Amino acid sequence: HMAAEYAVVLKTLSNPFWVDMKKGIEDEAKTLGVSVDIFASPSEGDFQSQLQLFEDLSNKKYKGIAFAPLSSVNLVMPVARAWQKGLYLVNLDEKIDMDNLKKAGGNVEGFVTTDNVAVGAKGADFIINKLGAEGGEVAIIEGKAGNASGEARRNGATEAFKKANQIKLVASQPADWDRIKALDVATNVLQRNPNLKAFYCANDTMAMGVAQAVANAGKIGKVLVVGTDGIPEARKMVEAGQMTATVAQNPADIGATGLKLMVDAAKTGKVIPLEKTPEFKLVDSILVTK
Known part of the structure; x- marks a missing residue:
């Protein structure tokens, strides 16, 4: 043309x-x-x-x-x-x-x-608001080290958690953008933290793995799972009550x-x-x- x-x-x-x-x-x-x-x-x-x-x-x-x-x-x-x-x-x-x-x-x-910092803060803030006065234990499932987007989301979420005294960040561990690594990392966090109330996950590929780990641990509705990106499968999982939320890009x-x-x-x-x-x-x- x-x-x-x-x-x-x-x-x-x-x-x-x-x-x-x-x-x-x-x-x-x-x-x-x-x-x-x-x-x-x-x-x-x-x-x-x-x-x-x-x-x-x-x-x-x-x-x-x-x-x-x-x-x-x-x-x-x-x-x-x-x-x-x-x-x-x-x-x-x-x-x-x-x-x-x-x-x-x-x-x-x-x-x-x-702004990937505000993305991670939005995911953390949703969790903080859901846990209310009593707060409790949260964990971050990180991207691969040295990823600027991943690091910005981790920084945003970590900063937002630090400012709520009622929140305890018990674990912050990389699953390097991998669904099955996230399944494994989340399974181990759940095993170490029987009182965990939430995960923030630096992307949906990882979040969907974390959702599986929460489902396997019988913790649907007791451990929140917040993704990032708003990819179709994550939105389906949100619709089905398998993930709590995802911070979607536009x-x-x-x-x-x-x-x-x-x-x-x-x-x-x-x-x-x-x-x-x-x-x-x-x-x-x-x-x-x-």
């Missing part, structure tokens, strides 16, 4: 989060009356694949590109070149390394994301907000100055309960 006015580079289209963001962008494009070409990294996970696609798009006729980079650094150079060429650029989801982008002589109009609105921010910057007919702090838009997470 003939190229749209705008392009979007997503990380992947391999799961509902990214399909939902693509749907969000299309729905917003129709409302705004603009055309958008939406792409994923042509080879899943492939940093160079995504760099090559971004370069190909910034060599075409696009007014702007919104991008969710595979890593903080992988798109720094072609994003810096696209800014220098005068394209209106919006960073979605994963924050590009802005030190490196400025060092390369680039900038972006804006960054649209979910990829549709990260996408819609990102496109709107790009179109609004384009309408000024000047890209953001090198020196200027980009726009910063947070999309709230949604607590999903029965």
Whole structure:
């Protein structure tokens, strides 16, 4: 076909989060009356694949590109070149390394994301509110060490628990984004803590394992299980009373907000100055309960 006015580079289209963001962008494009070409990294996970696609798009006729980079650094150079060429650029989801982008002589109009610290605090706060005055014992099932998202969720939840005197955080252990490792880690926490009242789980893949461990221990309704992401299976488990809750992301609105921010910057007919702090838009997470 003939190229749209705008392009979007997503990380992947391999799961509902990214399909939902693509749907969000299309729905917003129709409302705004603009055309958008939406792409994923042509080879899943492939940093160079995504760099090559971004370069190909910034060599075409696009007014702007919104991008969710595979890593903080992988798109720094072609994003810096696209800014220098005068394209209106919006960073979605994963924050590009802005030190490196400025060092390369680039900038972006804006960054649209979910605050993973507030996500973990929202999951903890739900538990604190459910346990009320008496509080009690809670545990965190962490992601893989050194994951910035995972660490942000752990920090948010841990900080929220620390501020409730009636809460005791008895265990905080990694299950490295793995369902069966989470099943095993949660089984062991339950065995060590017969009075546990809740788990916060840094993602739903792990949360669904924790749900199985609570079910096996005969603790449905006695040990709360809170996930993160709002993936379809987790929502089914919430509906069925097998998980208590999941803190859902809103990829549709990260996408819609990102496109709107790009179109609004384009309408000024000047890209953001090198020196200027980009726009910063947070999309709230949604607590999903029965």
